[PDB]
Design a protein around this ligand. Structure first.
Ligand SMILES: NS(=O)(=O)c1ccc(S(=O)(=O)NCc2cccs2)s1
Ligand SMILES: [Hg+2]
Ligand SMILES: [Zn+2]
Length: 256
């Protein structure tokens, strides 16, 4: 079924998921000169103080680090949001070369990878009811550029050998997601969708202005991962990013 190759990659997704062609799809190009600075946007409140990670899993499209979301332990509030959104997981999208890999672009510039911290609106009781709502999800997106090592990222990089193929998981407790944040929390925000099937239009995107840098050896490890399951022919998990979609009647507000 879907994936990222020539035969099953994003330009075919519309045949099984018609909403691919919809009105509020992500990612988009952020044109900085056309973004509306909006001084009513409150500051973001990221409270990742009591976050509990549980495991890391290769799901055949990316690796995800899952968090215990049965209590308000790691939450996002403020900014463009109303209500509290709980952290349930984070994943990355990366490229086969350092000059591509982000999903969102800034003035058409692509970064090496993009981190998504996925949150769901607690108003709706669980993630499953939240993906049935226009304001059910908030994804915090962070660009990664190649440069110095991000020390807080190393823990994730060392375990990737344990989960090389589709379906494997490892326990991954006590990981603190605060080590992945930039100094500045300035952002752009617009309404969009998930960037992989089912491509539901449930998401308030918050894309941070400031990138974090990781070294080439760190993003290099991402590329050694596999799309295939164990014992199937190896396909390297590289280029698992969707192309920018038409913004069509949406405006990107900027907090700066
Ligand atoms: N790239 S992204 O951040 O926009 C995401 C892609 C998929 C995401 S999900 O795993 O949280 N939901 C996928 C679903 C699972 C069950 C019902 S929909 S978040
Ligand atoms: Hg929705
Ligand atoms: Zn994503």
């Amino acid at each position: 079924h879907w994936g990222y190759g020539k035969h099953n990659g994003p330009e075919h997704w519309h045949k099984d998921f018609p909403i691919a062609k919809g009105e509020r799809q992500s990612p988009v190009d952020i044109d900085t000169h056309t973004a509306k600075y909006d001084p009513s946007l409150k500051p973001l409140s990221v409270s990742y103080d009591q976050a509990t990670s549980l495991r890391i899993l290769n799901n055949g499209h990316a690796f995800n680090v899952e968090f215990d979301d049965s209590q308000d332990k790691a939450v996002l509030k403020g900014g463009p949001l109303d209500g509290t959104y709980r952290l349930i997981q984070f994943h990355f999208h990366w490229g086969s070369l350092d000059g591509q890999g982000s999903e969102h672009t800034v003035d058409k510039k692509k970064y090496a990878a993009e981190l998504h911290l996925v949150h769901w609106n607690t108003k709706y009781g669980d993630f499953g009811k939240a993906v049935q709502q226009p304001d059910g999800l908030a994804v915090l997106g962070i660009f990664l550029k190649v440069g110095s090592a991000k020390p807080g990222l190393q823990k994730v990089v060392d375990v990737l050998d344990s989960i090389k193929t589709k379906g494997k998981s490892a326990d991954f407790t006590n990981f603190d997601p605060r080590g992945l944040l930039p100094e500045s929390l300035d952002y752009w925000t617009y309404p969009g969708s998930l960037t992989t099937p089912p491509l539901l239009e449930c998401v308030t995107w918050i894309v941070l202005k400031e990138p974090i840098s990781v070294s080439s050896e760190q993003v290099l490890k991402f590329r050694k991962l596999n799309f295939n399951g164990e014992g199937e022919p190896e396909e390297l998990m590289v280029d698992n990013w969707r192309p920018a979609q038409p913004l069509k009647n949406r405006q990107i507000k900027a907090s700066f």
